Design a protein around this ligand. Structure first.
Ligand SMILES: Cc1cc2nc3c(=O)[nH]c(=O)nc-3n(C[C@H](O)[C@H](O)[C@H](O)COP(=O)(O)OP(=O)(O)OC[C@H]3O[C@@H](n4cnc5c(N)ncnc54)[C@H](O)[C@@H]3O)c2cc1C
Length: 391
């Protein structure tokens, strides 16, 4: 029997969640996935630990989804980040919160998240067929026909959850945009968002250092968040966020101690005048950062003259960094752009052009910061798309 009430294409978080709600509402539901495994992209989020959502309040959630977050009022009125947390804990998955509201499985293993979702799908009678690339979708009368190279499936309701365009090696290569265009939907310009930065800097001096809530400035863009020094440049939220405003050739500025004024730092130094400059700074900064700034100066605080102190303080508060480029769309964490939201019903995620056609997840023209916000949108829009609505 190749006929289902609801067919979902793409088994990332949107598709898995859509399969669960579709089954929960009593639809006979089929999830088709290109890869052998579900949630291949999802599994690599949060350094492989799976940043499944964010525990913030409404203000935090909206701030975390700056690419059309407003569209989600109705979705979030039906299923939100607290429902995601509840769902996992109610199915015996223990969750924890880390910095900036980031939620993870306590196990620190993505398979904990993915297996719980599969288990729920099975328990609700959903069917999943993996290792099956869908290559065609068409609608005739009131039936969608979904085809691989090899087989055909039909349904009354189709949900497209095939992702965006970044990290195409995980399986997100744009098929959902093709389906959209086939049904005469507008797909907006697609472009990199949340892109690690390439810099011209001595990377080995600092690589692997993470800094908490430091400030990166370029023009009027001042971003305060965590920063990661990498072998090629900068990553972590502060760099990812600023990457929306730089593309190469710019000088950006780093303030490693945003909570201390230049005067506070001058007082700190005066109160530690008998000390080694590098050692006394360890209470404020990681040792490798203290090494970087203090290397060319005299060893003890009191051995610095006034010029040296002022020079050092300005370096700590305003380090110039030369940005040479940013990762391509393929090498970025999020796709900015997707199916035009004007053509989508925000309450149901149904196409305004073709009845029974739905989109959820990053295939839509919604983009968010890393830290759980894209996964939240995908899970929540998935849930809602899979739900039935009565009136
Ligand atoms: C390295 C990295 C780190 C990230 N970290 C974070 C983070 O910390 N917080 C956060 O919120 N977001 C993060 N993201 C983004 C987040 O992972 C995605 O936005 C989210 O997974 C989108 O979910 P989705 O279900 O819309 O699409 P995806 O998870 O991309 O799933 C789409 C699925 O559709 C399948 N598919 C595509 N075409 C076909 C076809 N023709 N037939 C069958 N199946 C198909 C694909 O194989 C894929 O499994 C990160 C992304 C990357 C790449």
């Amino acid at each position: 029997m190749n006929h289902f009430d609801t067919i979902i294409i793409g088994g990332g978080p949107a598709g898995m969640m859509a399969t669960i709600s579709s089954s929960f509402y009593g639809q006979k539901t089929l999830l088709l996935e290109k890869n052998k495994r579900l949630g291949k992209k999802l599994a690599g989020t949060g350094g492989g630990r799976c940043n499944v959502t964010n525990n913030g309040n409404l203000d935090d959630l909206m701030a975390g989804i700056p690419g059309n977050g407003r569209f989600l009022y109705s979705v979030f009125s039906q299923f939100d980040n607290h429902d995601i947390i509840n769902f996992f804990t109610e199915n015996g998955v223990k969750l924890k919160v880390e910095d900036h509201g980031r939620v993870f499985p306590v196990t620190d293993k993505s398979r904990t998240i993915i297996e719980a979702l599969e288990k729920k799908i099975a328990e609700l009678g959903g069917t999943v067929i993996t290792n099956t690339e869908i290559v065609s979708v068409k609608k005739t009368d009131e039936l969608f026909t979904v085809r691989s190279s090899d087989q055909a499936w039909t349904c009354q309701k189709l949900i497209v959850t095939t992702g965006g365009k970044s990290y195409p090696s995980t399986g997100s290569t744009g098929f959902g945009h093709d389906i959209a265009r086939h049904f005469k939907h507008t797909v907006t310009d697609l472009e990199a968002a949340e892109s690690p930065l390439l810099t011209d800097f001595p990377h080995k001096a600092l690589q692997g250092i993470s800094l908490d809530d430091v400030t990166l400035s370029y023009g009027k863009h001042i971003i305060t968040h965590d920063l990661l020094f990498t072998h090629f440049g900068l990553s972590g939220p502060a760099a990812l966020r600023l990457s929306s405003f730089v593309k190469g050739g710019e000088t950006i500025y780093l303030d490693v101690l945003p909570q201390m004024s230049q005067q506070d730092l001058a007082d700190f130094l005066e109160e530690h005048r008998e000390k080694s400059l590098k050692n006394c700074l360890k209470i404020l900064l990681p040792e490798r950062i203290a090494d970087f700034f203090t290397q060319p100066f005299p060893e003890k605080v009191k051995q610095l003259n006034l010029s040296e102190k002022e020079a050092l303080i300005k370096q700590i508060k305003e380090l110039p960094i030369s940005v040479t480029g940013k990762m391509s769309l393929a090498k970025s964490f999020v796709t900015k752009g997707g199916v035009s939201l004007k053509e989508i019903n925000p309450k149901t995620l149904e196409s305004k052009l073709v009845p029974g056609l739905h989109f959820a997840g990053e295939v839509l023209d919604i983009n968010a910061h890393t830290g759980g916000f894209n996964i939240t949108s995908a899970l929540c829009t998935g849930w809602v798309a899979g739900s039935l609505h009565y009136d």
